[PDB]
Design a protein around this ligand. Sequence first.
Ligand SMILES: CC(C)C[C@H](NC(=O)OCc1ccccc1)C(=O)N[C@@H](C)C(=O)NCc1ccc(C(=O)NO)cc1
Ligand SMILES: [K+]
Ligand SMILES: [K+]
Ligand SMILES: [Zn+2]
Length: 357
Amino acid sequence: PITGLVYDQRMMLHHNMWDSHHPELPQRISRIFSRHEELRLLSRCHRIPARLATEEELALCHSSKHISIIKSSEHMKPRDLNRLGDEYNSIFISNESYTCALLAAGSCFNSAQAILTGQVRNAVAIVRPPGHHAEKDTACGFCFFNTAALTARYAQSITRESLRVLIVDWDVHHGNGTQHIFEEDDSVLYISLHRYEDGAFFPNSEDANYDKVGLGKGRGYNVNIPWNGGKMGDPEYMAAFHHLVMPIAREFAPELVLVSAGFDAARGDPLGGFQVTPEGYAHLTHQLMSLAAGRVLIILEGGYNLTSISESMSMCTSMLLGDSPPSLDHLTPLKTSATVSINNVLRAHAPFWSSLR
Ligand SMILES: CC(C)C[C@H](NC(=O)OCc1ccccc1)C(=O)N[C@@H](C)C(=O)NCc1ccc(C(=O)NO)cc1
Ligand SMILES: [K+]
Ligand SMILES: [K+]
Ligand SMILES: [Zn+2]
């Protein structure tokens, strides 16, 4: 019955010095925030302050070497920023990038704290740079530190090590970093829906396929739902939630839900190629609100059509605030390949979840 919101325009200062039209724009977060004002959603939320993550907090998921290298970019000359960024897959770095990544993480820590202390029921974090491609030891795909992964560990650090955290990653890309950070971990259930195209879609790794179910005691706690072929939209995402995400999540019984909420599967996204609607994102949000006593934190990842992400994320906040959820068509037939994907995931995870048996 209270929704928190965190936004700090300081996270706009991370910018691409070599191509100012790179799609991971400063204006992503300001546009999303402005839309919350236009729709009169902001005043309905409890405003949560951003803060820097500490280096000790980054160490919850990242190696000291990786922390130190990204920190070293704070005062680099342009030539060295360009050279360092080129050492990673799909990274640009400015002198503000490290601090902006710290603010993204710390904003979500404060949001998770507000939820778990009972100050708010749920929250939204309008943050950048994104996080889910960041690995323990490297930056990747516009991401420096894995905000969502860190937030899960932060949450466990103020409650208990075994706090059950569900991370739902509906960004159109696989969150390779989140999967790897938690791959051997049965306390954090990672579920990702993502365009895959048999490895043709970024991050171009078979790690994103449906047969990567986790490792050791984490077998069953990594659920990859990869899309191939068709332009997927609300029917396919709703079906994946009905057949896979929600049955597994209910059986896991999370105590906190983090959404790696990229909006690049949205209709109109320049690089996702998918057609999830703002109503579709609202439907998925409302579904997730049935878990964890409503304790849901929505964390912006990707999403690159400024109007599309602003409308889609605002509709999620409207859902968190309790507004009436949309009625959508669960009977629209799926793209053929989507049924194939769902059946492949079901077969892979039925050994681990009785709700699939
Ligand atoms: C119309 C364009 C916006 C297309 C887009 N191009 C693109 O990302 O530009 C990157 C760029 C690098 C250097 C200078 C300028 C720009 C793309 O999808 N390129 C393909 C090759 C790709 O996969 N690029 C890498 C990539 C990594 C992470 C995410 C994400 O959002 N993850 O959550 C998206 C894309
Ligand atoms: K994803
Ligand atoms: K896991
Ligand atoms: Zn993405």
